[PDB]
Amino acid sequence: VDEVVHCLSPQKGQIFLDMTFGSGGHTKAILQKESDIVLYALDRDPTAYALAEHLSELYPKQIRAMLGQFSQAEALLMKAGVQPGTFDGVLMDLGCSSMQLDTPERGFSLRKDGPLDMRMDGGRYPDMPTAADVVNALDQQALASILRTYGEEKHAKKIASAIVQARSIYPITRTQQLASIVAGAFPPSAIYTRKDLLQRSTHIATKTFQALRIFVNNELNELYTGLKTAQKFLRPGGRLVALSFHSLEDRIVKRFLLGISMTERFNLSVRQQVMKTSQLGSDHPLMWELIHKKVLSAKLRAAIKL
């Protein structure tokens, strides 16, 4: 949290929005530096939200826990009486929490086997499609588009073809099952003895899992909406600090901080919204002062609102 909080520079008497409370690390680090604050602690994950509620028992004056997605943040802040132009700082750490990555039943990680779930909202929305629903239902071209667009997976076609053939034999319901199917798309001479293809990053199924995660959790639209809410509720002179972990979300943060307008779904025709993957984050007056960019496999960007 150190560098994140460092760029925030919490001062006595200030008010903060942590939009990605997660395991609580940054919010706790902020409280260690300055206890005389108010902090709204938001997460879309019930598990993280329950940790924020617990924290609010030890810090009842400061902490206000909220359960909600980035796209729900504005309504939650309005219902809590929070006015635009209020926050001295807003924090968006886009990384998966340790609870998400280290609970195999959630199905985020390539380490231990578990259900191909991958919903950040956990059990909050039982009708929300899982990664399993997606890979068992979509057709080959649609799967390939998701993997190419969201995972930047050069081998989208072959991998999507392998999923479609595999799911005809048995439904794909587990993470290691999907990882094995992905690996089976590559001839042995492509991958033999290649230890990097098993390592934490650079694992052969990494981009596939990342693409499904972004799709299942609508991460690109959510992020853009969250950024606009952060800007609206920051006061003049307040700081936005964002931590990005892959290139699509970092490009969205970057473009946002440059005041470059990007795709609102309301501007897309119904046909495009149904049949095309999002182009957010893809290649094809001043509102901010950009005060930090640093690589920590994550990229921190910090800005002061003018």
Author numbering: 8 to 291, 303 to 314, 329 to 338
The paper states:
The m4C methyltransferase METTL15 maintains mitochondrial homeostasis by catalyzing m4C839 located in 12 S rRNA helix 44 (h44). Similar to other members of rRNA methyltransferases, METTL15 has a two-domain structure: an MTase domain (domain 1) and a scaffold-like domain (domain 2). The domain 2 of METTL15 contained five α-helices and one η-helix, which formed a scaffold for the binding of RNA substrates or other functional proteins. Here, we reported a series of crystal structures of human METTL15–hsRBFA–h44–SAM analog, METTL15–hsRBFA–SAM, METTL15–SAM and apo METTL15.
To further investigate the mechanism of m4C839 modification, we determined the structures of apo METTL15 and the binary complex METTL15–SAM. Comparison of these two structures revealed that the root-mean-square deviation (r.m.s.d.) of the Cα atom was only 0.145 Å (269 to 269 atoms). Therefore, we mainly used the METTL15–SAM complex for subsequent description. Comparison of the electrostatic potential surface of these two structures showed that the positive charge at the SAM-binding pocket of METTL15 was significantly enriched after SAM binding. The crystal structure was solved by molecular replacement using the structure of apo METTL1570–407 solved previously as the search model.
